[PDB]
């Protein structure tokens, strides 16, 4: 099916005058791969997942001198950074990054990305069409013309084109059979009575993988949404992901509730009930 | 693989 | 990574050839095309960024495919004497550094 | 024609086991600098590159060598203990916000016994 890769960078400074400290993290959908922290004597960049350490040390050096020279560069970008805001040197500050490229079910390229926040909110992004930006406000249009004049967008289309699309699907075919691979959810209902408005039915999705799901309840066919408790979906730890959602009933009633979920493993959506 | 910045790729 | 033939050209004035620059990169960054007279430095001529794309200046035409770039240099004149540098920035390093080829020495016999 | 970037001395002739030092400026508005050096019967090699007073990539240059750029931005290669092979063309380049490399007029370098 669908398949993406993507790069968080972290760039953060520190009180008084230290070294601001960068992270590099990549990820295939759901799957972390590599880490790069440069909070240390001799800092590299580290595999995280097995499909990864195949690669030979050209790959892992490459990956490192990237990371390394950021780690310089975006330390004289939060200076910028504080400059076009006036804010002083102490001063804790933070640069978040995410690019890379979106596969359809072909394993042709659907849309690439880039997006930068300065502490937290929007600041910088390339617009769909890969050649443009949208920038958040007067010190972002700065940063726009520094990167018009740089053809940073030129750059980053011809990567997210031709590099990034080239390698995620070596690590799709390398790491296949668990990035290719989509596990259903296991799926229950549960009833916890509590007297005052009655009984609680909780709708459970558990150890599927990847993380994009849908639970609803609905009551005679109808999407309720509005008292209806949904919960994050969180990781189970070995790589599955779980989710809930929860309906208050008025007891004797629950039969004509509906629970649903959607998911790429799930070649149509599941119709549940709770189960005396 | 990640993407390298060229010069002058600072914000 | 970069591999320009021929190492060295003899043409007579007037008659056309075209100079191959090959190159493997993780990703290209840029192809560059330069020319150098003896006892001078590279003299920037042409940069082209994607497949197909060409650019032309007089008797200079370059072209490019994914593996590699063409000087195309049409019925030339013996001021055309020079050596032909080819070279890539890649997308896989950081900067702006460029791996030059060992160029084509070009002599015209007018 | 010339680039703009300023290269000296552009001749030196020097005997084995001594030290040179060749000087560079950038084009101006450029705040890069790369060094390169091209032997005989050799292409260009990439030696060390730098931007804005910091080191930022290194190529195959030898411990001998050493470099520097200053708050001027211009900058300064240092070769030690010269032997016969360090005979070369030593060029430098500045790098526009565009990515275009920009060459110098390069500083030939003899090394005689």
């Known amino acids: 099916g669908s398949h993406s890769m993507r790069y968080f960078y972290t760039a953060m400074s520190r009180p008084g005058r230290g070294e601001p400290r960068f992270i590099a993290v990549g990820y295939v959908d759901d799957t972390q791969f590599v880490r790069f922290d440069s909070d240390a004597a001799s800092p590299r960049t580290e595999p995280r997942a097995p499909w990864i350490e195949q690669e030979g040390p050209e790959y892992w050096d490459r990956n490192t001198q990237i990371f390394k020279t950021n780690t310089q560069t975006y330390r004289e970008s939060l200076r910028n950074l504080r400059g076009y805001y006036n804010q002083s040197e102490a001063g804790s500050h933070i640069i978040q990054r995410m690019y890379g490229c979106d596969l359809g079910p072909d394993g042709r390229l659907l849309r690439g990305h880039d997006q930068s926040a300065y502490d937290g909110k929007d600041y910088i992004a390339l617009n769909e069409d890969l050649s443009s930006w949208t920038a958040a406000d007067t010190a972002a249009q700065i940063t726009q013309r520094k990167w018009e004049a740089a053809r940073v967008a030129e750059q980053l289309r011809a990567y997210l084109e031709g590099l990034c699309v080239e390698w995620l699907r070596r690590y799709l075919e390398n790491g296949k059979e668990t990035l290719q691979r989509a596990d259903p959810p296991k799926t229950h209902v549960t009833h916890h009575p509590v007297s005052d408005h009655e009984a609680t039915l909780r709708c459970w999705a558990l150890g599927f993988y990847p993380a994009e799901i849908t639970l609803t309840w609905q009551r005679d066919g109808e999407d309720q949404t509005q008292d209806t408790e949904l919960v994050e979906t969180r990781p189970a730890g070995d790589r599955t992901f779980q989710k809930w959602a929860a309906v208050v009933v008025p007891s004797g009633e629950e039969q004509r509730y509906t629970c649903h979920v959607q998911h790429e493993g799930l070649p149509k959506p599941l119709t549940l009930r709770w189960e005396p | 693989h990640p993407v390298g910045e060229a010069d002058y790729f600072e914000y | 990574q970069v591999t320009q033939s021929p190492e060295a050209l003899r043409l007579q004035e007037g008659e056309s050839s075209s100079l191959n620059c090959s190159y493997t990169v993780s990703g290209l960054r840029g192809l560059f095309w330069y020319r150098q007279d003896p006892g001078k430095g590279p003299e920037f001529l042409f940069t082209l960024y994607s497949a197909g794309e060409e650019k032309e200046k007089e008797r200079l035409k370059a072209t490019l495919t994914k593996k590699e770039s063409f000087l195309h240099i049409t019925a030339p004149k013996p001021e055309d004497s020079a050596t032909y540098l080819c070279a890539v920035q890649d997308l896989g390093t950081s900067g702006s550094r460029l791996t030059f080829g060992e160029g084509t020495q070009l002599t015209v016999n007018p | 024609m010339d680039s703009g970037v300023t290269q000296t001395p552009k001749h030196l002739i020097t005997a084995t086991g001594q030290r040179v030092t060749l000087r560079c400026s950038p084009r101006?508005?450029?705040?890069?600098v790369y060094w390169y050096q091209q032997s005989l019967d050799q292409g260009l090699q990439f030696l060390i590159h730098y931007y804005n007073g910091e080191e930022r990539a290194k190529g195959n240059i030898l411990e001998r060598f050493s470099a520097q750029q200053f708050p001027d931005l211009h900058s300064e290669l240092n070769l030690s203990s010269l032997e016969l092979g360090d005979s070369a063309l030593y060029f430098c380049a500045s790098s526009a916000r565009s990515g275009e490399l920009f060459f110098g007029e390069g500083s030939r370098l003899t090394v005689l016994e």
């Open positions: 101006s508005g450029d705040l890069s």
